[PDB]
């Protein structure tokens, strides 16, 4: 067995903490047991893990999960809402070959929404579910019980885990609600990374990232807003404040409407990055295997496919996907004594109404 602690910091996450404990084999069952928890400015999460890598003779794995999650939207630079949830997952893992692995799973989740600040897109979803709370009050509540089928595919032919120089990684996750669930929706996510070395020593590398998300409702319902996609921040479009890209909340009056600069995400998202990895200037070659400099061009968009620009023509068309943000800047990664570290300075040279900027972004990782 083993156990571990983690301290991190991020511009978007603040000071973060992590810990866990795992029994490699639980009393000869053949299934490893684990307890893991993390906390940052906007999230508290804990889970119980129960997995066996050899459920069949030829590699297929079986995994169990039992989790609790608390989420403060305003702390994640979104319009205010609170989501307290818990659930379980059963996941099968199939290694297809050396570079590919598939996984299929069944999931249950209970979502408890509270403290929701009335806004158009959020309430529109609530209307699609049959919920019609006050538009002047922040003391509301909404609860759902959902069952999901979860697909997954991972390609990984990266030459190396730390600081890749060659190869690609692709991760595709989908999920759909099983009938009987309160919600009715599907949701798909795609992440790609491609490293192309342009020199024989592999010090000069071209990196191309893409990140995609699409989800929508079935049966006339919408996808829950707390399943939305986001963009902007240290890990998507640098130089933009975390999650700022895309629609903004159109608030209902308190006790007519108000345009805001508070991001709410959306049910569709596209992000791409072209990054040029070089040797690190102003640092010795002794410290080359532990540092990575790069110059990047980031772009992304987030939109709301169900935004009704007819009913709300006085405000920007948040269903429009073509308002593509862009930034350029320089980044520095360092395997420090304090763990994995990342500086980045970026100027958002193409921004839009409400987009908040954040030139300097910083992250110390807590998991390695």
């Amino acid at each position: 067995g083993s156990f571990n602690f983690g301290i991190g910091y991020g511009t978007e996450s603040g000071v973060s903490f992590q810990a866990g404990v795992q029994q490699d084999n639980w009393l000869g069952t053949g299934y490893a047991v684990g307890i893991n928890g993390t906390k940052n400015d906007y999230q508290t999460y804990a889970e119980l893990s129960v997995t066996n890598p050899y459920f069949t003779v030829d590699g297929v794995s079986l995994g169990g999960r039992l989790f609790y999650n608390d989420f403060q939207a305003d702390d994640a630079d979104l319009s205010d809402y609170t989501n307290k949830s818990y659930g379980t997952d059963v996941t099968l893992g199939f290694p297809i070959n050396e570079y590919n692995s598939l996984r299929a799973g069944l999931g249950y989740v209970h979502n408890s929404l509270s403290n929701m600040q009335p806004q158009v897109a959020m309430w529109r979803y609530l209307y699609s579910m049959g919920e019609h709370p006050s538009t002047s009050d922040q003391d509301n509540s909404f609860k759902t019980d959902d069952f999901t089928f979860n697909y997954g595919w991972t390609y990984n032919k990266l030459d190396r885990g730390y600081f890749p120089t060659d190869g690609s990684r692709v991760n595709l996750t989908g999920k759909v609600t099983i009938p009987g669930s309160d919600n009715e929706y599907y949701k798909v996510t795609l992440d790609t990374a491609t490293y192309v070395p342009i020199d024989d020593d592999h010090k000069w590398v071209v990196l191309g990232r893409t990140r995609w998300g699409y989800g929508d409702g079935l049966g006339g319902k919408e996808m829950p807003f707390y399943e939305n996609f986001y963009a902007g921040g240290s890990s998507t479009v640098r130089g933009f404040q975390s999650n700022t890209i895309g629609p903004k909340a159109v608030y209902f009056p308190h006790q007519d409407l108000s345009k805001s600069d508070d991001a709410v995400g959306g049910n569709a998202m596209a992000v791409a990055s072209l990054e040029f990895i070089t040797p690190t200037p102003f640092i010795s070659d002794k410290y080359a295997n532990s540092v990575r400099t790069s110059f990047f061009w980031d772009m992304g968009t987030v939109w709301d496919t169900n935004w009704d620009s007819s009913q709300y023509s006085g405000y920007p068309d948040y269903s429009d996907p073509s308002n593509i943000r862009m930034s350029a800047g320089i980044a520095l990664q360092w395997m420090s004594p304090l763990g994995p570290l990342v500086f980045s300075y970026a100027q958002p040279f193409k921004k839009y109404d409400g987009d908040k900027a954040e030139q300097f972004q910083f992250n110390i990782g807590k998991t390695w």
């Binding site: 156990f3 571990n4 983690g6 991190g8 992590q18 763990g339 110390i364 807590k366």
Partner: peptide, 7 residues
């Protein structure tokens, strides 16, 4: 940073 100790 991440501290890890095999018990």
């Amino acid at each position: 940073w991440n501290w890890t100790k095999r018990f």
